[PDB]
């Protein structure tokens, strides 16, 4: 049961809470980092105060803030949300929200993946088609089947290799 208490808070791998450089020498980054920061800061300070042998009242104060800081990271807003001081009073996304989405959920939704050999277009009736056929614009067929196409191109005296075939199609 002890395990419900934390004495080591884990840290999400940085690559998926990244620190991208965007346009204008400005940066984009996940809220987690800013949640993680302030937690580290309070822990480190707590170490100092304890090392100093500070009065237990100012230590309590620290421990209180630390507990809160951990709360704010794991599941922010189950005790009066923290926000980025400037920007706006937009509450920071915690792990819990990042997992499930804050919208009650996990429905609602926000649920679906994008897909690699796909396309969309306006449809028109094909009275000529037999029941198992459909009409595909070649322009669209050529992209959807590009990798397959490139190989046939190589199997035929119409391209030396694949790079040159791909270049043919750009």
């Amino acid at each position: 049961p002890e395990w419900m208490i934390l004495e080591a808070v884990p840290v999400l791998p940085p690559d998926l809470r990244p620190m991208v450089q965007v346009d204008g020498g400005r940066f984009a980054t996940s809220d987690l980092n800013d949640l993680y920061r302030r937690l580290i800061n309070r822990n480190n300070r707590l170490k100092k105060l304890l090392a100093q042998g500070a009065p237990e009242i100012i230590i309590r104060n620290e421990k209180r803030m630390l507990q809160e800081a951990v709360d704010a990271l794991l599941d922010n807003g189950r005790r009066g949300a923290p926000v980025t001081n400037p920007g706006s009073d937009r509450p920071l996304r915690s792990l819990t929200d990042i997992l499930s989405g804050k919208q009650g959920r996990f429905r609602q939704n926000l649920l679906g993946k994008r897909v690699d050999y796909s396309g969309r277009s306006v449809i028109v009736v094909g009275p000529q088609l037999k029941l198992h056929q459909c009409g595909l614009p070649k322009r669209m067929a050529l992209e959807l089947f590009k990798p397959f196409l490139l190989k046939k191109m190589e199997e035929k005296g119409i391209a030396p290799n694949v790079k040159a075939a791909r270049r043919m199609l750009e």
Binding site: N61, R64, M65, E68, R79, G80
Partner: peptide, 13 residues
């Protein structure tokens, strides 16, 4: 029962 939620500062004072 969400009474003593946002004490922090009041608390420390």
């Amino acid at each position: 029962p969400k009474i003593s939620t946002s004490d922090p500062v009041r608390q420390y004072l």
